[PDB]
Design an enzyme around this catalytic site. Structure first.
Site, PDB file in Angstrom:
ATOM      1  N   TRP A  27      -6.812  10.728  -7.990  1.00 48.32           N
ATOM      2  CA  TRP A  27      -8.833  10.357  -8.300  1.00 48.32           C
ATOM      3  C   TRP A  27      -9.512  10.094  -7.553  1.00 48.32           C
ATOM      4  CZ3 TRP A  27      -6.237   9.197 -13.324  1.00 48.32           C
ATOM      5  CH2 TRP A  27      -5.619   8.133 -13.209  1.00 48.32           C
ATOM      6  N   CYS A  84      -0.709   2.589  -1.242  1.00 51.50           N
ATOM      7  CA  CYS A  84      -1.574   3.005  -2.173  1.00 51.50           C
ATOM      8  C   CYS A  84      -2.096   1.866  -3.380  1.00 51.50           C
ATOM      9  CB  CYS A  84      -1.030   4.245  -2.986  1.00 51.50           C
ATOM     10  SG  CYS A  84      -1.847   4.333  -4.259  1.00 51.50           S
ATOM     11  N   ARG A 100      -1.630   2.088  -7.586  1.00 50.85           N
ATOM     12  CA  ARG A 100      -0.066   2.584  -7.908  1.00 50.85           C
ATOM     13  C   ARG A 100      -0.055   2.599 -10.035  1.00 50.85           C
ATOM     14  NH1 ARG A 100       3.369   0.152  -3.692  1.00 50.85           N
ATOM     15  NH2 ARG A 100       1.653  -0.332  -3.406  1.00 50.85           N
ATOM     16  N   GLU A 109     -13.450   5.732  -0.992  1.00 48.98           N
ATOM     17  CA  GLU A 109     -13.458   6.413   0.179  1.00 48.98           C
ATOM     18  C   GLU A 109     -14.928   6.984   0.580  1.00 48.98           C
ATOM     19  OE1 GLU A 109      -8.770   8.176  -0.729  1.00 48.98           O
ATOM     20  OE2 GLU A 109      -9.391   7.681  -3.192  1.00 48.98           O
TER      21      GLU A 109
HETATM   22  C1  HEM Z   1      -4.190   7.884  -9.632  1.00 49.06           C
HETATM   23  C2  HEM Z   1      -5.749   7.809  -9.032  1.00 49.06           C
HETATM   24  C3  HEM Z   1      -5.028   7.287  -7.261  1.00 49.06           C
HETATM   25  C4  HEM Z   1      -5.454   6.980  -6.836  1.00 49.06           C
HETATM   26  C5  HEM Z   1      -7.021   5.944  -7.514  1.00 49.06           C
HETATM   27  C6  HEM Z   1      -5.191   5.919  -5.666  1.00 49.06           C
HETATM   28  C7  HEM Z   1      -5.928   5.213  -4.193  1.00 49.06           C
HETATM   29  C8  HEM Z   1      -5.267   5.285  -2.838  1.00 49.06           C
HETATM   30  C9  HEM Z   1      -6.390   4.993  -2.419  1.00 49.06           C
HETATM   31  C10 HEM Z   1      -7.626   4.532  -2.075  1.00 49.06           C
HETATM   32  C11 HEM Z   1      -5.678   4.978  -1.013  1.00 49.06           C
HETATM   33  C12 HEM Z   1      -6.030   4.695   0.676  1.00 49.06           C
HETATM   34  C13 HEM Z   1      -6.171   6.357   1.428  1.00 49.06           C
HETATM   35  C14 HEM Z   1      -7.291   6.213   2.024  1.00 49.06           C
HETATM   36  O1  HEM Z   1      -8.307   5.404   2.566  1.00 49.06           O
HETATM   37  O2  HEM Z   1      -7.313   7.216   2.720  1.00 49.06           O
HETATM   38  C15 HEM Z   1      -3.663   5.777  -1.311  1.00 49.06           C
HETATM   39  C16 HEM Z   1      -3.039   6.032  -0.400  1.00 49.06           C
HETATM   40  C17 HEM Z   1      -1.650   6.893  -0.773  1.00 49.06           C
HETATM   41  N1  HEM Z   1      -1.573   6.743  -1.904  1.00 49.06           N
HETATM   42 FE1  HEM Z   1      -2.875   6.506  -3.761  1.00 49.06          FE
HETATM   43  N2  HEM Z   1      -4.154   6.493  -5.295  1.00 49.06           N
HETATM   44  C18 HEM Z   1      -4.003   7.689  -6.642  1.00 49.06           C
HETATM   45  C19 HEM Z   1      -2.683   8.142  -6.774  1.00 49.06           C
HETATM   46  C20 HEM Z   1      -2.123   8.630  -6.337  1.00 49.06           C
HETATM   47  C21 HEM Z   1      -0.465   9.517  -6.048  1.00 49.06           C
HETATM   48  C22 HEM Z   1      -0.805  10.608  -7.670  1.00 49.06           C
HETATM   49  C23 HEM Z   1       0.153   9.682  -4.714  1.00 49.06           C
HETATM   50  C24 HEM Z   1       1.253  10.318  -4.715  1.00 49.06           C
HETATM   51  C25 HEM Z   1       2.215  11.452  -6.114  1.00 49.06           C
HETATM   52  C26 HEM Z   1      -0.272   8.700  -4.004  1.00 49.06           C
HETATM   53  C27 HEM Z   1      -0.042   8.775  -2.738  1.00 49.06           C
HETATM   54  C28 HEM Z   1      -0.917   7.519  -2.278  1.00 49.06           C
HETATM   55  C29 HEM Z   1       0.555   7.604  -0.995  1.00 49.06           C
HETATM   56  C30 HEM Z   1       1.648   8.335  -0.140  1.00 49.06           C
HETATM   57  C31 HEM Z   1      -0.780   6.490   0.131  1.00 49.06           C
HETATM   58  C32 HEM Z   1      -0.383   6.445   1.493  1.00 49.06           C
HETATM   59  C33 HEM Z   1      -1.388   7.638   1.948  1.00 49.06           C
HETATM   60  C34 HEM Z   1      -1.109   7.279   4.234  1.00 49.06           C
HETATM   61  O3  HEM Z   1      -0.052   6.807   4.435  1.00 49.06           O
HETATM   62  O4  HEM Z   1      -1.659   7.942   4.219  1.00 49.06           O
HETATM   63  N3  HEM Z   1      -1.845   8.620  -4.910  1.00 49.06           N
HETATM   64  N4  HEM Z   1      -3.815   5.298  -2.834  1.00 49.06           N
HETATM   65  N1  LIG Z   2      -7.626   8.495  -4.214  1.00 55.13           N
HETATM   66  C1  LIG Z   2      -6.509   9.305  -3.965  1.00 55.13           C
HETATM   67  C2  LIG Z   2      -5.221   9.548  -4.250  1.00 55.13           C
HETATM   68  C3  LIG Z   2      -3.955   9.482  -3.003  1.00 55.13           C
HETATM   69  C4  LIG Z   2      -4.489   9.560  -1.790  1.00 55.13           C
HETATM   70  C5  LIG Z   2      -3.242   9.832  -0.588  1.00 55.13           C
HETATM   71  C6  LIG Z   2      -3.734   9.537   0.123  1.00 55.13           C
HETATM   72  C7  LIG Z   2      -5.027   9.475   0.837  1.00 55.13           C
HETATM   73  C8  LIG Z   2      -5.662   9.916   2.709  1.00 55.13           C
HETATM   74  N2  LIG Z   2      -4.503   9.169   3.352  1.00 55.13           N
HETATM   75  C9  LIG Z   2      -5.075   9.655   4.574  1.00 55.13           C
HETATM   76  C10 LIG Z   2      -4.429   9.594   6.506  1.00 55.13           C
HETATM   77  C11 LIG Z   2      -6.006   9.470   7.498  1.00 55.13           C
HETATM   78  C12 LIG Z   2      -4.808   9.768   8.797  1.00 55.13           C
HETATM   79  C13 LIG Z   2      -5.893   9.852   9.918  1.00 55.13           C
HETATM   80  C14 LIG Z   2      -5.566  10.163  10.764  1.00 55.13           C
HETATM   81  C15 LIG Z   2      -3.986   9.281  10.981  1.00 55.13           C
HETATM   82  N3  LIG Z   2      -2.963   8.854   9.783  1.00 55.13           N
HETATM   83  C16 LIG Z   2      -3.595   9.613   8.568  1.00 55.13           C
HETATM   84  C17 LIG Z   2      -6.405   9.681   0.180  1.00 55.13           C
HETATM   85  C18 LIG Z   2      -5.797   9.353  -1.530  1.00 55.13           C
HETATM   86  N4  LIG Z   2      -6.854   9.222  -1.921  1.00 55.13           N
END
Ligand code: HEM
Ligand SMILES: Nc1ccc2ccc(CNCCCc3cccnc3)cc2n1
Ligand code: HEM
Ligand SMILES: Nc1ccc2ccc(CNCCCc3cccnc3)cc2n1
Ligand SMILES: C[C@H](O)[C@H](O)[C@H]1CNc2nc(N)[nH]c(=O)c2N1
Ligand SMILES: C[C@H](O)[C@H](O)[C@H]1CNc2nc(N)[nH]c(=O)c2N1
Ligand SMILES: [Zn+2]
Lengths: 413, 408
Positions: free
Chosen positions: B279, B107, B110, B284
């Site tokens: 947000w 993420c 963070r 994305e």
């Molecule tokens: C507040 C604004 C936030 C922004 C701008 C943000 C941004 C991002 C982005 C761009 C990704 C990559 C996701 C993708 O490409 O599919 C990500 C992943 C992730 N975020 Fe954040 N995020 C935010 C908030 C949060 C919050 C509130 C949580 C949990 C309480 C969180 C937990 C995670 C986790 C666990 C991933 C990894 C997801 C995965 O492995 O598929 N995020 N975030």
């Molecule tokens: N803006 C944000 C904030 C938090 C987010 C957390 C998670 C994600 C997207 N997770 C995408 C996983 C896609 C995938 C597809 C196939 C197998 N594994 C994973 C976006 C967030 N965006």
């Protein structure tokens, strides 16, 4: 380790099975509790270290030519072992040297151009004894590889390390690069990446023109002696002035670049033998120049100047003025190379070819080590197929390796 | 050993000690890196995990080994004995949720980790209950465009037969429809989930941006369909600040990204339903959702309208169209006063966050493959930042899609 590891492509759903990882010979830096995949880099061989390394390689070579276990295979093992016993080293045959070099390239997990690996002209420079001789070999390499713009991949291999006090080294990081000059006011003229090497050249006697695009001299070390300076004949240095098909003002930026990327600071390891001077060259992917050389903040850093000429709104990052200018610069680079008929590949074509290569390698070889962090281009990553491709990274030998900069280790005579 | 990470642009070197705390595996070994692979209880297993978590909790409030700490360990142990599980205190639930986010190596957002509104939904027992909690979440997090990070936590797993699951991958997503002619209408990522909703009774409008219903499973029962009240669903019409034809593309997106299919792990306990939201980072939507070949895949249409030369890849028509689309997305959200961050600002914040974490925590686990944005990689600071990836608990984990494990 599991016999079969699967990689998936998340765009095409294609799943490939890797068995080649079982042949992994060296450590990656990762452990079971930490990944170091984004880390840039995470006294000779004794007779007993050398024996199994040579055999590993010789076996691999005879397996490749479908003569494994043959009389010639067994004889070669015996002759190599004898040589190690009586001299603490051995000499590769020309065929083995060529095989090893091509495979070091085939095995280079960070290289996206590996579809080309089997077409590599190998120049055997193991008879070289002096820096003047190295200069001759290098000039011949540059001219062959340049080929008036129709670039051809090549490697020139100088004598292997012996005791480590007689190393051949090219002190340049690439055969052709531009000087960088730190000004007393803290600004840099030319390429900031090359400031330190430039200062070394100046200290060794180089008289600098002090321009923005001054081709650096060769600094060549033979047989462990102090390195010597040579100027590459400028007719051998192909350059491309950068212009843009739409923006007439782009040429007024006065940018240009050289046609031949020729990395000269790596170490080639074959069968436990170490070739500390092995300059090799291919051709450019456009982003190497347009994104990295030109737009890196610590490099030519031209985004702002381009942006200003484009009349972009540069007060908010969210206008994406940087991204907008970055594309136009990369358009200009490709357009200028194609116009001057100098080989170059765009990142879309290179990554598509790499995916096909990787699939072929999985089929014919049981795998293809690949370093995603390096393979994905530095702009527009996800609109290239490699972004969506899971990869496995591991180290096979023969290989290209990093080695310390020679000025840090050289014993001045 | 202490490990150093370097930024190759700033020459800043940080020293990681925090990784020595991890006990979970990455997937890599000494000989093979799997950094680009997408996905690489009992009472007896339970207590050390609980103890570990209680310990770091009391360590975090500077009362390690206190009377309170000691009573807690005792209480938890007793509870794991007599019940085969235990219940977190409210303070612990909040700490655990914020830290799962803090520990999420993928993420880039963070820097915000300690600002997380935690909604305790552990008293929930039915899908209607889940629906109520989810609506409240969406309304709170949306906040008229001024988005606020939030997580809603439903009861923890017990036996595996009574899981709470949100079947949707995100609370708000668009339907995808497989067309007779073999093309796809709407979001192809959701074609399967859409079919399950349709089969369960959902009457699809069959449009390009039909908000999916919620499909909610409580206590192991069959999932139930719910329509999110439309006034709770904030959407942004995408237009371009220069190309007046862009609005004619008919593009829109929803303002609230609310991931609902992950598993929250805290102190051995597993929360299989924990929808959370923050947000958007602009890319994305503008790069992945809109331009992935397997998603809305609009590059070709946009390049057409920009009258670009599309015969050769080396004209970079794709890259040009990509930038314009992302300009449009950011502009549209900003014009509608809906929170969004561009990848330049996001990655800058992330570098500052890393710096903070190294100073106060001894490190920051980070997955370069995910942190670097899907466009303009090396003109963002994170491209040049070495990162160490390692797994710290509490954490968010992936889990199987419910429709592959559920018996009806
Ligand atoms: C507040 C604004 C936030 C922004 C701008 C943000 C941004 C991002 C982005 C761009 C990704 C990559 C996701 C993708 O490409 O599919 C990500 C992943 C992730 N975020 Fe954040 N995020 C935010 C908030 C949060 C919050 C509130 C949580 C949990 C309480 C969180 C937990 C995670 C986790 C666990 C991933 C990894 C997801 C995965 O492995 O598929 N995020 N975030
Ligand atoms: N803006 C944000 C904030 C938090 C987010 C957390 C998670 C994600 C997207 N997770 C995408 C996983 C896609 C995938 C597809 C196939 C197998 N594994 C994973 C976006 C967030 N965006
Ligand atoms: C023929 C066309 C070629 C293309 C298009 C190509 C492309 C590339 C690119 C884009 C990189 C990443 C470079 C960077 O970002 O610094 C790379 C790395 C690399 N290439 Fe290739 N290459 C080609 C030929 C070769 C040849 C001929 C060799 C050796 C025989 C080679 C060996 C390597 C190695 C060892 C690396 C890793 C460099 C490092 O770790 O610093 N390549 N290549
Ligand atoms: N077109 C090509 C072909 C082959 C190439 C081989 C190598 C390289 C450049 N490697 C650059 C390393 C940069 C660096 C900086 C700091 C520390 N370590 C390494 C380009 C190629 N291009
Ligand atoms: C920190 C990170 O490992 C470093 O910036 C890498 C990222 N990927 C790269 N990829 C390529 N092709 N070339 C590079 O120089 C780098 N630099
Ligand atoms: C194969 C590769 O791991 C996969 O495409 C990853 C690459 N990096 C990513 N990074 C982010 N932020 N989101 C993603 O979905 C992905 N996908
Ligand atoms: Zn790894």
């Amino acid at each position: 380790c599991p016999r079969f590891l699967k990689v998936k492509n998340w765009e095409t759903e294609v799943v490939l099975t890797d068995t080649l990882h079982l042949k992994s010979t060296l450590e990656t830096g990762c452990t079971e509790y930490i990944c170091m995949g984004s880390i840039m880099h995470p006294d000779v061989a004794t007779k007993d270290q050398l024996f199994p390394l040579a055999k590993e390689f010789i076996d691999q070579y005879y397996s490749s030519i479908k003569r494994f276990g043959s009389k010639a295979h067994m004889e070669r093992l015996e002759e190599v072992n004898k040589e190690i016993d009586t001299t603490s080293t051995y000499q590769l045959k020309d065929t083995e040297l060529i095989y090893g070099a091509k495979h070091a390239w085939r095995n280079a997990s960070r290289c996206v151009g590996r579809i080309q690996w089997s077409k590599l002209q190998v120049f055997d420079a193991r008879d070289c004894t002096t820096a003047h001789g190295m200069f001759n070999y290098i000039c011949n390499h540059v001219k062959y590889a340049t080929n008036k713009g129709n670039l051809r991949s090549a490697i020139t291999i100088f004598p292997q390390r012996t005791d480590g006090k007689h190393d051949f080294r090219v002190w340049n990081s690439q055969l052709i690069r531009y000087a960088g000059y730190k000004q007393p006011d803290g600004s840099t003229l030319g390429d900031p990446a090359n400031v330190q090497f430039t200062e070394i050249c100046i200290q060794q006697g180089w008289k600098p023109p002090r321009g923005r695009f001054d081709v650096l001299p060769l600094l060549l070390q033979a047989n462990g002696n102090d390195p010597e300076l040579f100027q590459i004949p400028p007719e051998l240095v192909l350059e491309v002035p950068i212009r843009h098909p739409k923006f007439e003002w782009f040429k007024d930026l006065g940018l240009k670049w050289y046609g031949l990327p020729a990395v000269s600071n790596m170490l080639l390891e074959i069968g436990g033998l170490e070739f500390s001077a092995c300059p090799f060259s291919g051709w450019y992917m456009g982003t190497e120049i347009g994104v990295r050389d030109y737009c890196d903040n610590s490099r030519y850093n031209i985004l702002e100047e381009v942006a200003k000429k484009m009349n972009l709104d540069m007060r908010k990052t969210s206008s994406l003025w940087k991204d907008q200018a970055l594309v136009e610069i990369n358009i200009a680079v490709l357009y200028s190379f194609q116009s001057d008929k100098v080989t170059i590949v765009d990142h879309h074509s290179a990554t598509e070819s790499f995916i096909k290569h990787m699939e072929n390698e999985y089929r014919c070889r049981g795998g293809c080590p690949a370093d995603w962090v390096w393979i994905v281009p530095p702009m527009s990553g996800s609109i290239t197929p490699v972004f969506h491709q899971e990869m496995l990274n591991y180290r096979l030998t023969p290989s290209f390796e990093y080695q310390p900069d020679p000025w840090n280790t050289h014993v001045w005579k």
